[PDB]
Design a protein around this ligand. Sequence first.
Ligand SMILES: CC(C)(COP(=O)(O)OP(=O)(O)OC[C@H]1O[C@@H](n2cnc3c(N)ncnc32)[C@H](O)[C@@H]1OP(=O)(O)O)[C@@H](O)C(=O)NCCC(=O)NCCS
Ligand SMILES: CC(C)(COP(=O)(O)OP(=O)(O)OC[C@H]1O[C@@H](n2cnc3c(N)ncnc32)[C@H](O)[C@@H]1OP(=O)(O)O)[C@@H](O)C(=O)NCCC(=O)NCCS
Lengths: 121, 121, 120, 121
Amino acid sequence: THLLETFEMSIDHQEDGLVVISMPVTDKVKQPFGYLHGGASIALGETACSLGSANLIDTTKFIPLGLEMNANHIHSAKDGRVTATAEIIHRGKSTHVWDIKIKNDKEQLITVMRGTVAIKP
Amino acid sequence: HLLETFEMSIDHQEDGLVVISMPVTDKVKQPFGYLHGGASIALGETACSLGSANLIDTTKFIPLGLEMNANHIHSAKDGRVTATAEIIHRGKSTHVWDIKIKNDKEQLITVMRGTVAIKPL
Amino acid sequence: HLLETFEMSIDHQEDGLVVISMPVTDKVKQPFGYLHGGASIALGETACSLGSANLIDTTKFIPLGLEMNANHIHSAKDGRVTATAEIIHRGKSTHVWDIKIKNDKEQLITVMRGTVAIKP
Amino acid sequence: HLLETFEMSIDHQEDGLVVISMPVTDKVKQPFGYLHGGASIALGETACSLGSANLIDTTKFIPLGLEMNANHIHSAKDGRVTATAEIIHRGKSTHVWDIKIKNDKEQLITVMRGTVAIKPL
Ligand SMILES: CC(C)(COP(=O)(O)OP(=O)(O)OC[C@H]1O[C@@H](n2cnc3c(N)ncnc32)[C@H](O)[C@@H]1OP(=O)(O)O)[C@@H](O)C(=O)NCCC(=O)NCCS
Ligand SMILES: CC(C)(COP(=O)(O)OP(=O)(O)OC[C@H]1O[C@@H](n2cnc3c(N)ncnc32)[C@H](O)[C@@H]1OP(=O)(O)O)[C@@H](O)C(=O)NCCC(=O)NCCS
């Protein structure tokens, strides 16, 4: 579990094609200046869509591998919690594509992301 | 401080080139688990943020990650990963960075491009 | 001018929203040939720049595509494709746009995110 | 046929490397107008797609652009632009390509990364 544990992530909701994961903005995940590290936000996103893809496939026959991730950083986070909402865009045979939005307490967009997950035999 | 959480070590910095490594330990692994893709990307974003900070007057400007993208190529299970960030474009208001992240065996783990905004303090 | 090359038609505009279409013809196809991924991406970037123009004083500023990314989801063989660009963020120096490109059969062809720099 | 529409010329090919140029004309400009960002990207996607095609049996497989990203660095108002695609990773089911697009003055216009899926015909 341990990066999920390291960042103290909590899965707030899962259903087919939708994953919501939150985490506290603490000093251990901040940049030095310091705001929430952009990379920590991206890691939260990649966690959410990887979990979503795993939930959509037969994990005894297939494995979901993060293939491509991209992200725009929009607003900063200094404290409280941030929440990633991952919604599936495309559930293909060999790839899943996910839209992920990461917000702070004040409902501001911190990071917007798209992730492509490879579905491998 | 994420730099400290992931035990990142700056191996080399010069104008337009930053090399930062970190050990693949449980704290940065996915549950299964290999090195978490998000941790790899965070290492990358740290490297180019540091590079950009090194190119500007940090008493007047702040380097903020604007856009990040990444392809995950191979997995890392142990040893170290090393991010090498080389500047592609040093603009007035934006920097663009190429980042390659390799494991011990010189395998490409993640390749990234990062866009860093240079904003007034 | 490429707008003309691809026969783009603005179907709807309002602040922070653009809907723009184009026909899928041979001139924008791959050899095999499907709708070229690059043509779809060009429709998207067009949507972005137009949208940003509608949001700024174009007598003082110019919207320049800064970063673009895209996932190609389905192929398009014929008919028309329609890009809906909705703004995510209206900043001083950048605008971020979400773009969805669908075909006639209401299939998702391409999804994009665009970052447009606002320059003097 | 887009290649013809854009008047593209294949200047050099070898395994894992493609160079394709095209003129900067009114057919591919923005209204303002410089070279359309979409046109540059289209050139890039053409180059890596050709690169992947040159590495496979195209009577059995087809190279399909899966994910494309690009940073636009400088504008082009005239002359020719040249895209150089070098392969980063040759996997069984995906290829990842680095693409640099330059003008006559040897300036970087667009930098791109392309992920190409290899699908059975
Ligand atoms: C998405 C894609 C990359 C493959 O990944 P995938 O999602 O796991 O493959 P899937 O089988 O699940 O996707 C099915 C759809 O993708 C497309 N597709 C799948 N295999 C294809 C092939 N061998 N040839 C052409 N198109 C194909 C079809 O549009 C298909 O729609 P359908 O399900 O109604 O038949 C690829 O199929 C695709 O859509 N490419 C977009 C077109 C494009 O970029 N053209 C320019 C080439 S540079
Ligand atoms: C969006 C951004 C790239 C600049 O583009 P911009 O749209 O032209 O700038 P804007 O002022 O119009 O954007 C406003 C928001 O961006 C953020 N921002 C803008 N300038 C900033 C600065 N100098 N320092 C910190 N955050 C800033 C703020 O959250 C701001 O929110 P607000 O309007 O409610 O005050 C950048 O400001 C940003 O938000 N980066 C995200 C944080 C990040 O990546 N941190 C990790 C650094 S490696």
